[PDB]
Design an enzyme around this catalytic site. Sequence first.
Site, mmCIF file in Angstrom:
data_model
loop_
_atom_site.group_PDB
_atom_site.id
_atom_site.type_symbol
_atom_site.label_atom_id
_atom_site.label_comp_id
_atom_site.label_asym_id
_atom_site.label_seq_id
_atom_site.Cartn_x
_atom_site.Cartn_y
_atom_site.Cartn_z
ATOM 1 N N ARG A 23 60.231 28.717 100.668
ATOM 2 C CA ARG A 23 59.166 28.028 101.384
ATOM 3 C C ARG A 23 58.268 27.230 100.444
ATOM 4 O O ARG A 23 57.780 26.158 100.809
ATOM 5 C CB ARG A 23 58.326 29.024 102.185
ATOM 6 C CG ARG A 23 57.445 28.341 103.220
ATOM 7 C CD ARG A 23 56.409 29.276 103.783
ATOM 8 N NE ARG A 23 55.616 28.619 104.818
ATOM 9 C CZ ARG A 23 54.386 28.989 105.151
ATOM 10 N NH1 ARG A 23 53.818 30.011 104.525
ATOM 11 N NH2 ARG A 23 53.724 28.343 106.106
ATOM 12 N N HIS B 287 57.324 23.301 100.915
ATOM 13 C CA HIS B 287 55.966 22.771 100.930
ATOM 14 C C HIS B 287 55.648 21.904 99.719
ATOM 15 O O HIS B 287 54.675 21.154 99.732
ATOM 16 C CB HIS B 287 54.942 23.903 101.064
ATOM 17 C CG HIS B 287 54.818 24.436 102.459
ATOM 18 N ND1 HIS B 287 53.777 25.245 102.859
ATOM 19 C CD2 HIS B 287 55.599 24.261 103.552
ATOM 20 C CE1 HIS B 287 53.918 25.544 104.138
ATOM 21 N NE2 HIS B 287 55.016 24.959 104.583
HETATM 22 C C1 HEM Z 1 60.406 22.580 110.931
HETATM 23 C C2 HEM Z 1 59.029 22.955 110.704
HETATM 24 C C3 HEM Z 1 58.591 24.165 110.176
HETATM 25 C C4 HEM Z 1 57.478 24.817 110.600
HETATM 26 C C5 HEM Z 1 56.505 24.358 111.681
HETATM 27 C C6 HEM Z 1 57.357 26.022 109.811
HETATM 28 C C7 HEM Z 1 56.376 26.988 109.994
HETATM 29 C C8 HEM Z 1 56.281 28.212 109.344
HETATM 30 C C9 HEM Z 1 55.287 29.219 109.638
HETATM 31 C C10 HEM Z 1 54.214 29.164 110.722
HETATM 32 C C11 HEM Z 1 55.532 30.253 108.806
HETATM 33 C C12 HEM Z 1 54.731 31.545 108.785
HETATM 34 C C13 HEM Z 1 53.752 31.593 107.630
HETATM 35 C C14 HEM Z 1 52.869 32.825 107.659
HETATM 36 O O1 HEM Z 1 52.793 33.484 108.715
HETATM 37 O O2 HEM Z 1 52.245 33.129 106.623
HETATM 38 C C15 HEM Z 1 56.685 29.891 107.994
HETATM 39 C C16 HEM Z 1 57.340 30.724 107.089
HETATM 40 C C17 HEM Z 1 58.528 30.441 106.415
HETATM 41 N N1 HEM Z 1 59.154 29.218 106.466
HETATM 42 FE FE1 HEM Z 1 58.772 27.678 107.671
HETATM 43 N N2 HEM Z 1 58.382 26.125 108.902
HETATM 44 C C18 HEM Z 1 59.138 24.967 109.087
HETATM 45 C C19 HEM Z 1 60.229 24.634 108.275
HETATM 46 C C20 HEM Z 1 60.731 25.361 107.205
HETATM 47 C C21 HEM Z 1 61.711 24.873 106.242
HETATM 48 C C22 HEM Z 1 62.294 23.462 106.225
HETATM 49 C C23 HEM Z 1 61.908 25.881 105.333
HETATM 50 C C24 HEM Z 1 62.726 25.898 104.194
HETATM 51 C C25 HEM Z 1 64.022 25.266 104.103
HETATM 52 C C26 HEM Z 1 61.036 26.973 105.755
HETATM 53 C C27 HEM Z 1 61.042 28.260 105.232
HETATM 54 C C28 HEM Z 1 60.215 29.316 105.589
HETATM 55 C C29 HEM Z 1 60.319 30.650 105.074
HETATM 56 C C30 HEM Z 1 61.443 31.165 104.173
HETATM 57 C C31 HEM Z 1 59.259 31.353 105.562
HETATM 58 C C32 HEM Z 1 58.886 32.784 105.216
HETATM 59 C C33 HEM Z 1 58.062 32.819 103.941
HETATM 60 C C34 HEM Z 1 57.576 34.211 103.582
HETATM 61 O O3 HEM Z 1 57.919 35.175 104.298
HETATM 62 O O4 HEM Z 1 56.850 34.339 102.575
HETATM 63 N N3 HEM Z 1 60.260 26.620 106.837
HETATM 64 N N4 HEM Z 1 57.153 28.638 108.355
HETATM 65 CA CA LIG Z 2 54.672 18.117 96.055
#
Ligand code: HEM
Ligand SMILES: [Ca+2]
Length: 306
Positions: free
Chosen positions: A38, A42
């Site tokens: 993630r 970002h």
């Molecule tokens: C398409 C739009 C996307 C949205 C709106 C989104 C949104 C989110 C949100 C709301 C969380 C929760 C964060 C929290 O509760 O602290 C999250 C976690 C995560 N996202 Fe996304 N995400 C998106 C795309 C992606 C992409 C492209 C990747 C990587 C290829 C990604 C990988 C992850 C991972 C691995 C987590 C878990 C991180 C952890 O547990 O520390 N996300 N994302």
């Molecule tokens: Ca950057």
Amino acid sequence: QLTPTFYDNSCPNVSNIVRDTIVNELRSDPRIAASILRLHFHDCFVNGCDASILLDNTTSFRTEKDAFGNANSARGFPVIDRMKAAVESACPRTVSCADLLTIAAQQSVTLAGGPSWRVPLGRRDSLQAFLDLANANLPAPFFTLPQLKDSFRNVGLNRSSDLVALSGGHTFGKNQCRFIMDRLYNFSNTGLPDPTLNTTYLQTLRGLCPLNGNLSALVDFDLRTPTIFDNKYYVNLEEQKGLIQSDQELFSSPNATDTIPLVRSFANSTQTFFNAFVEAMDRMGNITPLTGTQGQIRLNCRVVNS
Ligand code: HEM
Ligand SMILES: [Ca+2]
Ligand SMILES: [Ca+2]
């Protein structure tokens, strides 16, 4: 042009050092692989994969760590510092933080059971951080499908395959209750739960995230295999079990005519998904990089060289 062999002479052991660091960390923190992937996402969506997200506050510019999409959410920064120090020891002033984070993301996916590939390298580090740009560019869980598509296109990823494949990053990792409270109790001011959320799963989620409960409580993105990088994420969507709004919209949005077939294809074949994920990951990793003599090889990922 970025190339996978960039450090084959200057630091051949870089990938192995990154891997070892993640392996050791995973023992005490099983969520680190997801967190690192993630961080790379970002990083890339804000001025490109230039390690800008790793910079801390200065009196001239604010840190992206305080962006709405990063604050009290993004994690793993100390782990990146650790591998950077280890790499600096093995190969002084050679590997950029931008490249380090890219390798870390790929190794994280592989360690979690995902595909294995050599990422293009040659990126250099930013001379500043971009808080306002992060607030504008990072997509939010409440985005509609058109908004998600807009966000990806805004940074250079035009393909629906980019969006559907990269969203597969949610095949593991955690999500705070705060981001699904509307889906569970009052979606779009309707006073009702999101109709695209499976009713059985709705009950389960309500139990984990009661109204007026701890909004920071964590829930698994993938109810099938919470920590394994696989295509189960798409199987969930087909059953209306995507956790956040942005997940389920890939399959249920009125604008999903182009994304539904991709969701099905990835749910039907691990090979198809993995291939698409690698292709999309490399495309995201190619977003406006600093190369050649542009930027620096940051020694401390938290601060610009002085
Ligand atoms: C398409 C739009 C996307 C949205 C709106 C989104 C949104 C989110 C949100 C709301 C969380 C929760 C964060 C929290 O509760 O602290 C999250 C976690 C995560 N996202 Fe996304 N995400 C998106 C795309 C992606 C992409 C492209 C990747 C990587 C290829 C990604 C990988 C992850 C991972 C691995 C987590 C878990 C991180 C952890 O547990 O520390 N996300 N994302
Ligand atoms: Ca950057
Ligand atoms: Ca999974």
